[PDB]
A paper describes a structure:
KIF1A, a key member of the kinesin-3 family, is recognized for its high processivity and fast MT plus-end-directed motility. These attributes are crucial for the long-distance transport of cargoes in neurons. Mutations in the microtubule-associated motor protein KIF1A lead to severe neurological conditions known as KIF1A-associated neurological disorders (KAND). Here, we present 2.7-3.5 Å resolution structures of dimeric microtubule-bound KIF1A, including the pathogenic P305L mutant, across various nucleotide states.
To advance structure-based drug development, we determined high-resolution structures of KIF1A harboring the KAND-associated P305L mutation in complex with MTs, using the same nucleotide conditions as those for MT-bound WT KIF1A. In the ADP and Apo states, it shows a one-head-bound open conformation. Notably, in the ADP state, the P305L mutant displays a distinct map with motor domain densities appearing at much lower resolution compared to the MT densities. The lower resolution can be attributed to increased mobility, rather than poorer decoration of the mutant in the presence of ADP because the classification method separates the motor-decorated tubulins from the undecorated tubulins, and the resolution of the MT part of the map is comparable to the MT resolution of other maps presented. Despite the poorer resolution, densities between the tubulin tails and the KIF1A K-loop are observed, suggesting that this weakly MT-bound configuration is mediated mainly through electrostatic interactions between the K-loop and the tubulin tails. The low resolution of the kinesin part of that map prevented us from quantifying the openness of the nucleotide pocket, while the overall conformation appeared similar to that of WT KIF1A-ADP. We propose that the P305L mutation hinders the formation of a strongly MT-bound configuration, thereby increasing the fraction of weakly attached motor domains in the MT images. Supporting this hypothesis, the P305L-ADP dataset has the lowest level of kinesin decoration (~9%) among all datasets. The P305L mutation alters the structure of the KIF1A MT interface, hindering the transition to the strongly bound configuration (from step 1 to step 2).
Author numbering:
A (entry chain B): 1 to 434
B (entry chain E): 1 to 451
C (entry chain K): 4 to 357
D (entry chain A): 1 to 440
Write the structure that this text describes.
């Protein structure tokens, strides 16, 4: 049995977690009070991947909530699904970092790191065979980024064998709230490159563009973005909970995606999305599904893969479908888009199929791309970082918390080396002339 | 808990406190006698939020405040008015002569004695607090007590507490209008205290608020009540993120962290967008884009300096009401498109955004229309230097001939201290002119070859 | 543009000579050949190298690769390059008991001294010989080890509590709080090497009772300054001499355990793989520019994949001079280990068997 | 007695086992619950033949099989499905992580522990046997368990038993289609186990079976059930001679004796002639000559290699149904007449022939038409070299840049072993190119 421990940090992490747990609870037929009211017998077959059992035939999510402002925890607790989580897993303090990565990594986060690790240990020893962890956090924030990186470091030290994924929301070039986003993003990407096996990159403009352009929503809020991210997270771990014709645990994706240890940053995507009013006009077939899946405008990270080469891709389908059609469509998309795939992998499309689709759909699919175009996401950040570091715009706020400029320079150099790494895999093909 | 302490010093501070506490009482449902009927009507919730009120056994809610003055008239007007039963009887009045529009009397001779009582009351209120966030200090440059005693109080507070935040809502002298003759001396002598000790100081000018009232609200003969009401609206908008939930809530520490690049340049400008009369409330949509555009107009600023002459170092917008992040992002993009608003090249992001669900309230007998949306903008810019520079000129015209100096010297203040203040003053202006310079020379660079 | 590869085969030890052992390695020219002892009829496996050293029994008066011979081929060149201001590095690769430590240290009887003692003796000779009033020579020696991607000092008597490794933008990689000691004679350096090799991190496995659980790097910091009666005073002559002892490779077949033992084995094997890739990649661009002189961009050689290559960056890249010597066992039992060592040595300017 | 043990390893192995055991249960009249109604209806005979089933006291027939996997999903689906009461509860599942499409995990780290249970159950089944002929092993190259654990299992089996036959029904990676990125590494690393240990190995390709289903059985969107059904038909045709009488019955020993000229070239190709839809079953005679001709057509092969590019070292035909030796001999003569089929000059005879009376059966819900005649061909030819050569190219394109190598090295596998596999692989190809040369 493969069982996952879920960790959430910051406002963004807590809200994504709330929406994701609502989605999973509806998928497994769990009531807001925890009791089960499903119909299919497959739902209870492997519900223990996410949930634990409690004596009165009750199901408790294996989640851990982390923050430093009690406001978000109060918002989560006094909600439709607030009673589902166990109260002891709510870990919070007071006087949060406040978009100061130093405060949430050295000064404040060091207080709660011990309590959160105690809760994590208690959750893990109760798991008969742990598969891996899961962190949801905002990268440009305060307590989220800093304490998430600290937790990643401590957990990697404690549990080196287990898998660790990360659904991270990273800063935007355009839709930017906090002024000191670049410092937090740089000082976090310094740590994500070293202490994570996977890292799904998410951007707010990608989700907004999906909402305005495909879903045709007029007033998208954070609920819709959380909805899309939750759909992706459900799609990723689908094969660990339901049977299929080709199964794919989180590890097989880790093995088949990353060619080298540092290249573990992914571009997620989901299909179908059809505006709630135009689905009557378009038929749900595997060709349409994969054509929407590989579309540039659908990607959830705000990077054009046409500016780079796909190191690898993984497609996980849900629903009853013919294996031959899936294989033929993968061959077609590889052959037609001959210039967007590296040649030193002859066949770089991982495939998985699961029998149980989402509740109200005939079939769906999710996509994990690994492309060199992702380097853009760092370069922009790096540019802004330099523009704010060569003059020391807001530096003192960090240095009063017990840091120094050498750590900033180290983080900047680490990100630049990551960018060059990814850049070396978008031009070097095979030759002797060069 | 998100607890604040509001210190009101001087006549201006006391009257601003009157308006402010009227607004908070109306916001939280507290009656003038302190009782909340809604406690027994709803039966739950902390609507008497701890950010400004302390709850006793009988359900009475005592505000967390300390008024101070050296003239019994104004605080006795408070102590006999409508809200006589709300405040604790410790109003900390010095039943003696005034500072008499003299910094020295308010700082050196008369400012003593009362300082011990004030510090004892502040210590008691801080002891009652659990999770104190900062102090709000209301005063006025150019007054006697409001300048000298405020400086002494800030020095002692910085010594005693150290790390706790200290915000300032101060009234700077206006360019032309003035109700005193020795105003520039008092204003200049507070540069040291408002520079070294305060963590973030907001400047408001009576001329700017008069212009706003005349133009926007269409009030031909305003008085200080309207000015205090506007300032109270701004303070409530700043502090709302602590009290009511929202999609994005901005604590005081975040606000400071995003507004102050370097520790000496913490002088933002406060503006409030939907300042409009009830008759003109119709014929208008008051959407998010409209209020954001109105925030950037130089006409609606609350201190007489044009931001177009300077560069926008940083901005923080705090929205209240029926607002969604989409329109906020669109408005920010449209603002960034315009070339009339200049931003320093060492701040590519430029903005901070907060959103609160609680809409603003309308004070009965006031003049602001009821609205569904509003925003308060704090803009850290270099144009504030102008507001300083003008006043400096006046100081020179008085200090060349040593006019009125004997009043200060006779009250235990060394003459040379005058010059010292100006030096500090001058340095501050230079600092602002340094952070406007658009980028470093970057002379060092190399070339490349081909092989 | 200087990467060379060396191989040295050891002779039969006292236990192997006493027992019924057999030799399976042949030498000729630049080509070393090994034959499977149970199935030699299939084909001999051959590899070409820049340096090769033969040994099968003790005396071997004629045509024998004595310690001084390998020192002249590899050690003397690197010491001269260090004297001229170029960073230098010498790797000693091989399985546990392969005799790489014999080469690096040698016998303390002063009849066959390893590369390190001869190198340091010649350094002390050169400095004292070339010691004048104006030329100021200064040497400071440090010694460190990597265990599970964590750095440990060996010379300081302080506690062995894991330390951090950082990088100055101008001064390159470094280690926080790593002791370095000055030395003026062979006695001081010998004492330091004793105090260091007594404190290495080793563990008992099913292969050898003291198999190294950690890589070991002995660094010498050598500087030569000119201070004449003038104002135009510079140094322009600073070098680092790296002497690397690598823990032997292992397989899961021999490491019949889970957890700490398997984790250490996997970390060690990853470190050797990183180092091998680093040296091979450097060797490709050693071959390229030396004959093209075409600047095919930086082609940055990744050194972060592991910590061992990161700290060795100043001695690996730039104008440095690096070499590696692989220990080979000709005894019958160690055929599989020996062939794996030849495969590991094959890279870094691989030469075809002509 | 003519007793066989079928070992299913991996997901592909388990699903092929599902289809296969459905077929044999239908063949012998066994119900899904193990009971035979016909035992009390006929009152005699060994219709629950010992070649696959062991009969207990109560009249229940337990199959002689051992499923194995490192992921509880597929075997749990078996354990809850229709045939849950058929198999013994010993399904030998490792309730832990999968091999993760990684040879090292399946062979070195995770493959242990479960190996002892699997070998113990195999020993118990062998002890229950009296006259064991050989093992049938179903697996797939390119998977994690199916490659590494299969290699370890066959190493231990060859050590323990030695002289018993061991057949492979393995799925080779396709030329273009592929459902994994690290498939060539896993597929190449098993060359040593499938060369040294296995006695005869049959290769099947999913692309070829997809082509057969879309062309012959007029099905446009096939799934893995059809592929498993075809493979099950082939296995049944191979093993029929042990169970049912016939004019000429071809045991496994003589079949191997005829198909493997040298001990290193034991990679024949399996084909099945009357693959036809029931709608197209009409308008056709399906005589012996027709099916014999259809077996030799390159379109109907089950791995993408054209025999016209190579030479037929040997052929073994196994007929089922209304077949008489006169027409078989006539068809063999007609085949020998044609010059499009090349035979090596040192094999003048070229053919082995077996004939069985029991006709093939039709699975309810299947897609094969009911027929009176059928034939299964096992053709040992050099064209299989092509199927290897393509794979080698892909391996090189990964290994020049050490793509994905750290995943294997970190799990206790020495790096140089990679190269060793290719060397063996290369040698194997050379051997085939040696035997296609005309004598002088
Ligand atoms: C045909 C039908 O019944 O109507 C659909 C529907 O109209 C469409 C437009 C739905 C609809 O979704 C949206 O409108 C939407 C809006 C913002 C963000 C995301 C979705 C639907 O609301 C969403 C809803 O989806 C589900 O129930 C899935 O199981 C989904 N569930 C949830 O996200 C969920 C939401 C709240 C509470 C609990 C679960 C899911 C998806 C992936 C993995 C697990 C679960 C479905 C079937 C529909 C409606 C109802 C209109 C779509 O959603 C999905 C992910 O299925 C949007 O485009 C797809 C395609 C569908 O055709
Ligand atoms: N906006 C506003 N300004 C006020 C108000 N009351 C006083 N002021 C300003 O305060 C300044 C006068 O100095 P005061 O603050 O009254 O000084 P003080 O507190 O009375 O102390 P003394 O000088 O000793 O009497 C003038 O510039 C006034 O405009 C008010 O209610 N609103
Ligand atoms: N013909 C056929 N091939 C299958 C079937 N199921 C899986 N495969 C093939 O098996 C290969 C993948 O290897 P798997 O057998 O799934 O590996 P595994 O047994 O699951 O072991 P792990 O890699 O650890 O998951 C793919 O190339 C599939 O095409 C099947 O039912 N029929
Ligand atoms: N996708 C998503 N992003 C969010 C949400 N809430 C905030 N954000 C983003 O997170 C950033 C602020 O980070 P924050 O949540 O304050 O980090 P924290 O202080 O650690 O909680 C902003 O740039 C927002 O764009 C949410 O509900 N969903
Ligand atoms: N000329 C020589 N060439 C190579 N090896 C030699 C020579 N002379 C002696 N040796 C061997 O050097 C080895 C040194 O091994 P040792 O340093 O103990 O290995 P470890 O440090 O791994 O325990 C001895 O086993 C000895 O047989
Ligand atoms: Mg008064
Ligand atoms: Mg399985």
């Amino acid at each position: 049995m493969r069982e996952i421990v879920h960790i959430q940090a910051g406002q963004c992490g807590n809200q994504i977690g709330a929406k994701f747990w609502e989605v999973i609870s509806d998928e497994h037929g769990i009531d807001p009070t925890g009791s089960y009211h499903g119909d299919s017998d497959l739902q209870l077959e492997r519900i223990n991947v996410y949930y634990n059992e409690a004596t009165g035939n009750k199901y408790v999510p294996r989640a851990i909530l982390v923050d430093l402002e009690p406001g978000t925890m109060d918002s989560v607790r006094s909600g439709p699904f607030g009673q589902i989580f166990r109260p002891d897993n709510f870990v919070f303090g007071q006087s949060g970092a406040g978009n100061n990565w130093a405060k949430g990594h050295y000064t404040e986060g060091a207080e709660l790191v011990d309590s959160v690790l105690d809760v994590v240990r208690k959750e893990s020893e109760s798991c008969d065979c742990l598969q891996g962890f899961q962190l949801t956090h905002s990268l440009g924030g305060g307590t989220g980024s800093g304490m998430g990186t600290l937790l990643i470091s401590k957990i990697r030290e404690e549990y080196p064998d287990r898998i660790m994924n990360t659904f991270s929301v990273m800063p935007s070039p355009k839709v930017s709230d906090t002024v000191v986003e670049p410092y937090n993003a740089t000082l976090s990407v310094h740590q994500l490159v070293e202490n994570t096996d996977e890292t799904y990159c998410i951007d707010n403009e990608a989700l907004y563009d999906i909402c305005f352009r495909t879903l045709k929503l007029t007033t998208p809020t954070y609920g819709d973005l959380n909805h899309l991210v939750s759909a992706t997270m459900s799609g990723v771990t689908t094969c660990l909970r339901f049977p299929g014709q080709l199964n794919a645990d989180l590890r097989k994706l880790a093995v088949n995606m990353v060619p080298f240890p540092r290249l573990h940053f992914f571009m997620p995507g989901f299909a179908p999305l059809t505006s709630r009013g135009s689905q009557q006009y378009r038929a749900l077939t595997v060709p349409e599904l994969t054509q929407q899946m590989f579309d540039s405008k659908n990607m959830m990270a705000a990077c054009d893969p046409r500016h780079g080469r796909y190191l690898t891709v993984a497609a996980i389908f849900r629903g009853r479908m013919s294996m031959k059609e899936v294989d033929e469509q993968m061959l077609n998309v590889q052959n037609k888009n001959s210039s967007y795939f590296v040649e030193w992998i002859p066949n770089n499309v991982k495939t998985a199929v699961c029998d149980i689709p989402p509740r109200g759909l005939k079939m769906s699919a999710t996509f994990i791309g690994n492309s060199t175009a992702i380097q853009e996401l760092f370069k922009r950040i790096s540019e802004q970082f330099t523009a704010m570091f060569r003059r020391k715009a807001f530096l003192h706020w960090y240095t009063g918390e017990g840091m120094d400029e050498m750590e900033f320079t180290e983080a900047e150099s680490n990100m630049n080396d990551l960018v060059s790494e990814y850049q070396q895999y978008q031009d070097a093909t095979a030759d002797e002339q060069g | 808990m998100r607890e604040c302490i509001s210190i009101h010093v001087g006549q201006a501070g006391v009257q601003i406190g009157n308006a402010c506490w009227e607004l908070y009482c109306l916001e939280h449902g507290i009656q003038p006698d302190g009782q909340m009927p809604s406690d027994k009507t709803i039966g739950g919730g902390d609507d008497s939020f701890n950010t400004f009120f302390s709850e006793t056994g009988a359900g009475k809610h005592v505000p967390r405040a300390v008024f101070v003055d050296l003239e019994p008239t104004v605080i006795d007007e408070v102590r006999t008015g409508t809200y006589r039963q709300l405040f604790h009887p410790e109003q900390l009045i010095t039943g003696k002569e005034d500072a008499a529009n003299n910094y020295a009397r308010g700082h050196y001779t008369i400012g003593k004695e009362i300082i011990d009582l004030v510090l004892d009351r502040i210590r008691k209120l801080a002891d009652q607090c659990t999770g104190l966030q900062g102090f709000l200090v209301f005063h006025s440059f150019g007054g006697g007590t409001g300048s000298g005693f405020t400086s002494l109080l800030m020095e002692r507070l910085s010594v005693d507490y150290g790390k706790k935040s200290k915000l300032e809502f101060s009234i700077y002298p206006a360019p032309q209008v003035s109700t005193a003759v020795v105003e520039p001396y008092n204003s200049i002598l507070t540069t040291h205290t408002t520079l070294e000790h305060s963590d973030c100081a907001f400047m408001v000018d009576n001329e700017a608020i008069y212009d706003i009232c005349r133009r926007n609200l269409d009030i031909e003969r305003p008085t200080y009540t309207n000015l205090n009401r506007l300032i109270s609206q701004i303070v409530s908008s700043i502090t709302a993120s602590l009290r009511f939930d929202g999609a994005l809530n901005v604590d005081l520490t975040e606000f400071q962290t995003n507004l102050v690049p370097y520790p000496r340049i913490h002088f933002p400008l406060a503006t409030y967008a939907p300042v409009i009369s009830a008759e003109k409330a119709y014929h208008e949509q008051l959407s998010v884009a409209e209020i954001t555009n109105a925030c950037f107009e130089p006409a609606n600023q609350m201190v007489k300096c044009d931001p177009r002459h300077g560069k926008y170092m940083a901005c923080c917008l705090l929205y209240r009401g029926d607002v969604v992040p989409k329109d906020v992002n669109a408005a920010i993009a449209t603002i960034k498109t315009k070339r009339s608003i200049q931003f320093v090249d060492w701040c590519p992001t430029g903005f901070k955004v907060g959103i609160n669900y609680q809409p603003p309230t309308v004070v009965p007998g006031g003049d602001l229309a009821k609205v569904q949306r509003a925003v308060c903008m704090l803009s850290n810019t270099t144009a504030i230097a102008e507001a300083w520079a003008r006043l400096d000129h006046k100081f020179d015209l008085m200090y060349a001939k040593r006019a009125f100096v004997h009043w200060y010297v006779g009250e235990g203040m060394e003459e040379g201290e005058f010059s010292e203040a100006r030096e500090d003053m001058a340095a501050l202006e230079k600092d602002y002119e340094e952070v406007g310079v658009d980028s470093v020379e970057g002379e060092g660079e190399e070339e490349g070859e081909e092989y | 543009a200087s990467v060379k590869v060396a191989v040295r085969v050891r002779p039969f030890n006292s236990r192997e000579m006493s027992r019924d052992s057999k030799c399976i390695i042949q030498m000729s020219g630049s080509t070393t050949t090994i034959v499977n002892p149970k199935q030699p009829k299939e084909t001999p496996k051959s590899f070409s190298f820049d340096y090769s050293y033969w040994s099968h029994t003790s005396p071997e008066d004629i045509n024998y690769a004595s310690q001084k011979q390998v020192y002249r081929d590899i050690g003397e060149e690197m010491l001269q390059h260090a004297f001229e201001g170029y960073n230098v590095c010498i790797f000693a690769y091989g399985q546990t008991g392969a005799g790489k430590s014999y080469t690096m240290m040698g016998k303390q009887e002063k009849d066959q001294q390893g590369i390190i003692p001869q190198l340091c003796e010649d350094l002390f000779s050169r400095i004292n010989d070339t010691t004048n009033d104006n030329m100021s020579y200064s040497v400071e020696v440090s010694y460190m080890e990597i265990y599970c991607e964590r750095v440990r000092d060996l010379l300081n008597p302080k506690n062995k509590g894991n330390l951090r490794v950082r990088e100055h933008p101008l001064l390159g990689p470094y280690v926080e709080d790593l002791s370095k000691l000055a030395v003026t004679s062979y006695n001081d350096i010998q004492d330091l090497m004793d105090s260091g090799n007594k404190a290495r991190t080793v563990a008992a496995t099913n292969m050898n009772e003291t198999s190294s659980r950690s890589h070991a790097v002995f660094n010498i910091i050598f500087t030569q300054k000119r201070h004449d009666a003038e104002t135009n005073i510079t140094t322009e002559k600073v070098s680092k001499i790296s002497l690397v002892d690598l823990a032997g490779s292992e397989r899961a077949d021999s490491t019949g355990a889970k957890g700490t033992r398997l984790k250490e084995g996997a970390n060690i094997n990853k470190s050797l793989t990183t180092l091998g890739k680093v040296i091979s990649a450097l060797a490709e661009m050693d071959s390229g520019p030396n004959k093209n002189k075409k600047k095919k961009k930086t082609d940055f050689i990744l050194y972060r994949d592991s910590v061992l290559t990161w700290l060795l960056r100043e001695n690996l890249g730039g104008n440095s001079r690096t070499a590696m010597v692989a220990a080979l066992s000709p005894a019958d039992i160690n055929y599989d280990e020996t062939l794996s060592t030849l495969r590991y040595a094959d890279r870094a300017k691989q030469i075809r068997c002509n």
